[PDB]
């Protein structure tokens, strides 16, 4: 369980700034160069910045030169990215990753889960969660409506239920808010004896909702 844990994302106005951090565990952080790689919505992976294990070589993609500053604190096992003068093209999920072992060899096989940076003037709003009630095989789900910004996570029965689950990509409504559904197919016979609860988490607004989905 080598691990990289990014944090610090959120909503920031264009022209503003944010500081991302990445906490490493399970390895000698001081032995590895680190990189930031982002994925803007609807785009591919883009390498952003790298700092070598000893800080001797630092690089930036051209579009962030003079705006972003990468740094590391080996005593805290932490990597940082100070992002200034934020633009719309900076909206993305930001991964940290090891790249090289010292100046010896490229490795780049340890990645974090990403943290989301949203460059917007809009306000943070948490979702409402409504049930999609059931009627051989039955379908039921949760409707997660009117939140900002992306993303929302949905699980079922606290992660015990995974087979048959489909969580749809969010849809930007004309209001400017996002909405999505998560559904699951289950045996009809289990509808009264089994409990079904969807667990919606929207970290940007500290919204945690546990919704029971029962037949009407």
């Amino acid at each position: 369980q080598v691990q990289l844990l990014e944090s610090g994302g959120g909503v920031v106005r264009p022209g503003g700034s944010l500081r991302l951090s990445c906490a490493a565990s399970g390895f000698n952080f001081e032995d590895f160069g680190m990189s930031w790689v982002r994925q803007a919505p609807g785009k591919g992976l883009e390498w952003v910045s790298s700092i070598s294990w000893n800080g001797a070589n630092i690089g930036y993609v051209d579009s962030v030169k003079g705006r972003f500053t990468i740094s590391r604190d080996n005593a805290k096992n932490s990597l940082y990215l100070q992002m200034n003068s934020l633009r719309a093209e900076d909206t993305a999920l930001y991964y940290c990753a090891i790249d090289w072992y010292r100046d010896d060899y490229y490795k780049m096989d340890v990645w974090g889960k990403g943290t989301t940076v949203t460059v917007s003037s809009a306000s943070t709003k948490g979702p409402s969660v409504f049930p999609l009630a059931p009627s051989g095989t039955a379908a039921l789900g949760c409707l997660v409506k009117d939140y900002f910004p992306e993303p929302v996570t949905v699980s079922w029965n606290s992660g015990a239920l995974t087979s048959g689950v489909h969580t749809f990509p969010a849809v930007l409504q004309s209001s400017g808010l996002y909405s999505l559904s998560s559904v699951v197919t289950v045996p009809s016979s289990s509808l009264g004896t089994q409990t079904y609860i969807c667990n919606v988490n929207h970290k940007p607004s500290n919204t945690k909702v546990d919704k029971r989905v029962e037949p009407k």
């Binding site: 591919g44 992976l45 993609v61 409707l143 489909h166 990509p169 559904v183």
Partner: protein, 212 residues
């Protein structure tokens, strides 16, 4: 800066076959070329480094080669779990990913299982009604959904959403959400969802009556 050009952009391949992905560098990157698999919802996974060396635990059906500016990755004995976007990355002079190749697994035709959900009473308290139509586990991805309210064809008040290809059975699922005001919702009785797909003999309709 070095430009990495991948081809083809998209690729649809049946299980058991092989596909070859191409990567071109605008100038020589020697052998510092890597390949990545990126499944939606997960972190990127390194497949190849040094143009032709498999990373730890990568099976022999991933084969990479190339030198200078021209590279290939060949993925043989393709499985449903291979549905992903594949990127090359040069690491000769800092790092640059290519624009990616999206690989879809071509499976047999599968018809949608259709379900309709009326608005919950809780949501009606807010003054909005969301009617959701679910199309489950179908292939291929192309599907048509028509909303009919009291036999009146709806237009402009619905939004669709399609899942990423399922990694185990290679199907898609689609949701269409009809959004109406509580007042408009309460003026009509029959709410219908009509589904057209290649795997269905004729279009399928699921409906409900408001209140039943």
């Amino acid at each position: 800066e070095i430009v990495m050009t991948q081809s083809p952009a998209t690729l649809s391949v049946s299980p058991g076959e092989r596909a070859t992905l191409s990567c071109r560098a605008s100038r020589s990157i020697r052998s510092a070329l890597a390949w990545y698999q990126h499944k939606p919802g997960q972190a990127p996974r390194l497949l190849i480094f040094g143009a032709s060396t498999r990373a730890t635990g990568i099976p022999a059906r991933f084969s990479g080669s190339g030198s200078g500016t021209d590279f290939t990755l060949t993925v043989s004995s393709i499985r449903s779990e291979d549905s992903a976007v594949y990127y090359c990355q040069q690491y000769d002079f800092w790092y640059t990913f290519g624009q990616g190749t999206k690989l879809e697994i071509k499976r047999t035709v599968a018809a949608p299982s259709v379900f309709i959900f009326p608005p919950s009473d809780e949501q009606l308290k807010s003054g909005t009604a969301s009617v959701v139509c679910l199309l489950n586990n179908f292939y291929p991805r192309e599907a048509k959904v028509q909303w009919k309210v009291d036999n009146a064809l709806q237009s402009g008040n619905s939004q669709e959403s399609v899942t990423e290809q399922d990694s185990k059975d290679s199907t898609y699922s689609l949701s269409s959400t009809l959004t109406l005001s509580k007042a408009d919702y309460e003026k009509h009785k029959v709410y219908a969802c009509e589904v057209t797909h290649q795997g269905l003999s004729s279009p399928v309709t699921k409906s409900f009556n408001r209140g039943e």
